[PDB]
Amino acid sequence: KVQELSVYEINELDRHSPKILKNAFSLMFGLGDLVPFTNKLYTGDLKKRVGITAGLCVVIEHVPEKKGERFEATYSFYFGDYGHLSVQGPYLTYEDSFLAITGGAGIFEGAYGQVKLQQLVYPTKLFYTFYLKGLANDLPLELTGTPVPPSKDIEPAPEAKALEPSGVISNYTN
Amino acid sequence: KVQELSVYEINELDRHSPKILKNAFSLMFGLGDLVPFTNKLYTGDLKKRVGITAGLCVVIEHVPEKKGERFEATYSFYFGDYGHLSVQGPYLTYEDSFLAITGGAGIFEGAYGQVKLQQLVYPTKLFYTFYLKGLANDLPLELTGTPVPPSKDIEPAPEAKALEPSGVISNYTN
Amino acid sequence: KVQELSVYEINELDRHSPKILKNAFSLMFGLGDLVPFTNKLYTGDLKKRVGITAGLCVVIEHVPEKKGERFEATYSFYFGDYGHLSVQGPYLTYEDSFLAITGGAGIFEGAYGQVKLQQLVYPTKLFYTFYLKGLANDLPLELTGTPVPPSKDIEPAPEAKALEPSGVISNYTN
Ligand SMILES: CCCCC[C@@H]1O[C@@H]1CCCCCCCCCCC(=O)O
Known part of the structure; x- marks a missing residue:
């Protein structure tokens, strides 16, 4: 029983992130380079600020034939009052990857499965689709609006950027 | 289904920890600051030394309005020959949080759910309640004694602090 | 329900690993010492290169009485196009341990359970046995050949070491 949940991760350059x-x-x-990071997180439909990403990228190797890097990433996705999802796996700057969902808290307690990472603009925009199993309940409607198809040009709704109550979830993480 | 397990984590300042x-x-x-750590772990009833916590706190941000920090933490709880529990999630110096149970080994093989972290004395005393799902068996009686209610004033039993046989589990982690 | 999978991890000294x-x-x-690493990963039968390991060892304490170290390890095992497995738990340089399987992706989507880590040569040769639950399908035959007897003398098949088509899996991780 899978519930798809998509989110946009955006570096708006105001969180001191990434720190190399x-x-x-x-x-x-x-190998040796460590990259703590934290970016903003928005709903798949770009209408609402939900929270942040937060965790650590460990550089594994530069990949000159792919013109990119392989990181091993351990981090969480925060959804304000709802809870969070945690992940572990590959972040490749040069192609899409799947990370393991290691668990969750709040409405995400019990979560498992994998999440697809799509990098749209390096390094500032990423899109994710979690293929969520193990949830107690259907996901709240404000998180499951039909996603905006991922493109280089996507932007959050201005209400979400400006942090108006209509453009945020309750206690959105910051 | 849910087996609740409570433990006290105590920093006794004798493990070089924290290392900032x-x-x-x-x-x-x-962001950029990292805090490898390891504290001692005692049963919920404070009668027995079980083992240690071990892992890494990744600083995410200072939170000036709450006089404290947000960390992203990745770490394990060791219970001697029983095995371990692993977690991932938020550690906030100023309020309680919930972390994801990412997995387990030993008796905790198959472990999932979430764990409540309550800070009692910053930074040396913390109390956790694991809401454990997935376990093959009922938890051993020596780990499920009625917890001491959390307060600033709790101390592990003097026999546990002194590592006497009656105050430790067999091959408690150190 | 339980599928057993063994692999050999070998540091062939060509990946800048480990980085202390x-x-x-x-x-x-x-405590304070961090060791990013990445080794090569072969099948338990040593016939095929499958991919790599990748992650971070956090030093927890030196253990003088055992002439070794305790690490807390966060890392993934990559199996080419099959996907990956992620783990969290103890690496003790002086004795075997079990780590938690925190999740997977690809064929390992939904993976849980635990993995035995056995050190054969410190720190260049290790032998793992995953006790895998939650997989959608039986493991592919090319990953489940009878293991070579673990010892300090083990070597990958020459076709595997030389990256010949008959000694690699499809799109083996590098
Ligand atoms: C989970 C471990 C899996 C593979 C092992 C990988 O190589 C990493 C092991 C971590 C640390 C071992 C490195 C020892 C090097 C010692 C030189 C510095 C010193 O002796 O203080």
Whole structure:
């Protein structure tokens, strides 16, 4: 029994993120470089600010033939009063990936399955579709609005950007 | 289905912990700062030493209006030869939170659900209630004694602190 | 319900791994020390390269009485186009341990359970046995060949080491 939940992760450059901790003996990213990060999170339909992403990217290797990096990522997605989802897996700057859903809290207690990561604009816009199993209830309607198809040009609704009650969930994470 | 398990985490300052790696742009905690840690773990009734917590807090932001920090935490709870529980989620220095139970080993194989984290004395005393689903069996009686109600004043039993046989589980983690 | 899967992890010294981030005051490993890593992953029968391991070891304590270290490990095992498995738990340099399976993706979507970690040569050769629950299908035959007897002398098939078509899985992770 799968419930799809899609969200847009956007770096609006106002959270001091990403923070690069440089250790690799390379001008390029390399093993040793650690990247704590936190970006804003919006609903799949771009109408509401829900919260944030928060966690750690561990650089694994630069991939020169793909013109990108492989990170191993451990982080959570915060949904204001509703709770959160946690993930572990590959973040490849150069292609879509699937991460494991390691669990959740709140309405996400019991969550499991995988989530597809699509990078739209490096590094500032990402789109995700969680294929959620194990939820106690149907997801709230304000989170399951039909998603905006992902494109380079997507923007949150101005109400969501401006943090108006119509453009946020209750206690949205910040 | 839900088996509730409570434990006290106590920092007794004898494990080199916390170790603060301070990298942030700020004088206060900020993104970039990392805090590997390990504390002692006692049963919910405070009668027995069970083991340790072990993992990493990733600083996400300072929260000036709440006089405290938001961390993203990834860590495990060790119960001697019984096994361990793993978690991922928010640790807020100023209020309670819930973390995802990401999995378990030993008697905790198959573990899922969420855990409530209550801070009792910052930073040395914390109380957790795991709402455990998925376990193959009823939890052993030595781990499910009636919890001491959480307060600022709790202490582990003097026999547990002193690592006497009556105050430890067999091969308690250290 | 339970499907067993063994793999060999081998550091062939060509991936810049491990990377020791030294922060503890001591010449020996201690809390503060972080070790990003990535090794090669082969089938338990050693006939095929499947992919890699990738993640972070957090040093928890040195254990003088065992002449070794305790790490807390967060990492994934990559199986090419099959997907991946993610884990959280203890790596002890001086004895076998079990880690938690936190989830998977691809064929390993919905994966849970635990994995045994057995060190064969510190730290270049390890042998794993996953006890996998939650999988949609039986594991593919090319991953379930009888394991080579674990020892310090194990080596990948020469076709596997040389990346010949007959010694790799489809789109093996690198
Ligand atoms: C979960 C572990 C899986 C594979 C092991 C991987 O290589 C990583 C092990 C972490 C640390 C071992 C590195 C030891 C190097 C010692 C040199 C520095 C010193 O002796 O203090």
